[PDB]
Design a protein around this ligand. Structure first.
Ligand SMILES: C=C(C)[C@@H]1CC[C@@]2(C1)C(C)=CCC[C@H]2C
Ligand SMILES: [Mg+2]
Ligand SMILES: [Mg+2]
Length: 536
């Protein structure tokens, strides 16, 4: 009873991450200077007598430099004051920046601030077209709108068309920043990679840059990168010791890409343990996906699914040898989770991620059944199954395991599929389906997202893809709304969900996937985040 073909490619990375030894003297040097620079920066933020525009530009610069996580309380205190005071700036640049920064931090500033910039017909004054800084900040702000922000409904188009027109004659690095913005907006980018671009490509080249902030940003980035490299080394050894690339030769060898995903979810030092836990789940679920997608028979897949629901090592005899391997590994991983959380007294919350694993395996099996039967469900039924198979319910849940602050109440909220989680999952689903359609259409998939859509609504491939794009647009507004205070849980637990939506947009940018193993899209970001340090 034959199997498919060894179609996947090996890891292009070889063993270059397997061992990293931190030059402890260099790390301590960096850490010591950063401490001094951190305090100088804190004093900049706490300086009195600053004008609004200067204050917002300082916060914006520090956030783009990737060092705002050092100043969460200070920044919040300042934005909170700005929110509460009657800000009457009549310039497009400052208004739009004020709007963006406040909204991104959950402050529900009214979009009425943009009215003065529009005619009686609610359309932006074309006379703004010669204000590039205003256009740029309006552009960035337009990506943070909610359903209640229809005054901004054309801001994206307006600013885009005029930025395009102005870009080639702008000075550097403003030109590069505008051109980059048009390709990748700040709000929907992966924070470490926008940070890397801003530091090296923009701020390092800005005539007016603050030397203290630039040096701070460079040292902090490179020191954090050291931690990330230690983590990836530890994870690479863990993966190598599992030796799935030998025992399960049908499976993808992509632990570097999996680790990069965790880096998108959170990069800060306090989430080191969290990333190491998360990456192991991402690696293992890609094994499961592949087992379902191109190796297991119907009968094998049904026993696998059943064994997962029972979740007992006793069940392993009921499986073929090759499934025994991943099944034991899955059970071991969660017992490992329980042990490393027991000292903190948080072993009891591992069950929540276990339930999501059980869930996605059920839905994998449904997807297989559908495929075997040649079933094309209506979109509603399709999504009822296919949202879970994005892995995003599992990943979001898993992201909390290593977060010391995460409580049972936080897991209970997540367990109900709150709107902001649903939105992120939907974004991942429709982006994947748009990119996967043409290739999977030839692979025999009758139950692919776009096909379900085409058949349900009786529309073309283009119309279906536009309907899917609209779903993603709607979901981004939902995410944006879901960040607004008062939040149902602490914002610390929302940002992973937002960041999950960010990575998938970035990974499938410009279409499609992108193409052939999203590795090609990820490769330069992995180089920039995990191989090459920022030259100082
Ligand atoms: C979102 C997921 C659960 C994972 C992250 C890495 C992934 C899919 C990618 C994008 C490339 C290698 C294949 C595979 C492992
Ligand atoms: Mg699959
Ligand atoms: Mg797909």
């Amino acid at each position: 009873i034959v199997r498919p073909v060894a179609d996947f490619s090996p890891s292009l990375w070889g063993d270059q991450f397997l061992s990293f030894s931190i030059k402890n003297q260099v790390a301590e040097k960096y850490a010591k200077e950063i401490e001094a620079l951190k305090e100088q920066t804190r004093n900049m933020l706490l300086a009195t007598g600053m004008k609004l525009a200067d204050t917002l530009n300082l916060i914006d610069t520090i956030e783009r430099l990737g060092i705002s996580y050092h100043f969460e309380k200070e920044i919040d205190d300042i934005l909170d004051q700005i929110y509460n005071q009657n800000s009457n700036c009549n310039d497009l640049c400052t208004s739009a920046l004020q709007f963006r920064l406040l909204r991104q931090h959950g402050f529900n500033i009214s979009p009425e601030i943009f009215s003065k910039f529009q005619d009686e017909n609610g359309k932006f004054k074309e006379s703004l077209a010669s204000d590039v800084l205003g256009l740029l900040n309006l552009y960035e702000a337009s990506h943070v709108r909610t359903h209640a922000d229809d005054i901004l409904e054309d801001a994206l188009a307006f600013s885009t068309i005029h930025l395009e027109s102005a870009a080639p004659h702008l000075k550097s690095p403003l030109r590069e920043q505008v051109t980059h913005a048009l390709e990748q907006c700040l709000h929907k980018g992966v924070p470490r990679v926008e940070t890397r671009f801003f530091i090296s490509s923009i701020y390092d080249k800005e005539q007016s840059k603050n030397n203290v902030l630039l040096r701070f940003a460079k040292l902090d980035f490179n020191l954090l990168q050291m931690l990330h490299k230690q983590e990836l080394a530890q994870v690479s050894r863990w993966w190598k010791d599992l030796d799935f690339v030998t025992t399960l030769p049908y499976a993808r060898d992509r632990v570097v890409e999996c680790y990069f995903w965790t880096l998108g979810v959170y990069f800060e030092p306090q989430y080191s343990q969290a990333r190491v836990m998360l990456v192991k789940t991402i690696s293992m679920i890609s094994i499961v996906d592949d087992t379902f997608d191109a190796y297991g028979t119907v009968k094998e897949l049904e026993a696998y699914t059943d064994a997962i629901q029972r979740w007992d090592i006793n069940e392993i005899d009921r499986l073929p040898d090759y499934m025994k391997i991943s099944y034991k590994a899955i059970l071991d991983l969660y017992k490992d989770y329980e042990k490393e959380l027991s000292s903190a007294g948080r072993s009891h919350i591992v069950c929540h991620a276990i339930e999501r694993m059980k869930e996605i395996v059920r839905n994998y099996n449904v997807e297989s059944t559908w495929f075997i039967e040649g079933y094309t469900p209506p979109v509603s039924e399709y999504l009822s199954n296919a949202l879970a198979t994005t892995t995003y319910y599992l990943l979001a849940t898993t992201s909390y395991l290593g977060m010391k602050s995460a409580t049972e109440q936080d897991f209970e909220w997540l367990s109900k599929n709150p709107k902001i989680l649903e939105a992120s999952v939907i974004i991942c689903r429709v982006i994947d389906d748009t990119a996967t359609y043409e290739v999977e259409k030839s692979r025999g998939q009758i139950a692919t997202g776009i096909e379900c859509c085409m058949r349900d609504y009786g529309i073309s491939t283009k119309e279906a893809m536009a309907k899917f794009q609209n779903m993603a647009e709607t979901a981004w507004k939902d995410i944006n709304e879901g960040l607004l205070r008062p939040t149902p849980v602490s914002t610390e637990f929302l940002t992973p969900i937002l960041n999950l939506a960010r990575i998938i947009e970035v990974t499938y940018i410009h279409n499609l996937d992108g193409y052939t193993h999203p590795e090609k899209v990820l490769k330069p970001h992995i180089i920039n985040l995990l191989v090459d340090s920022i030259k100082i």
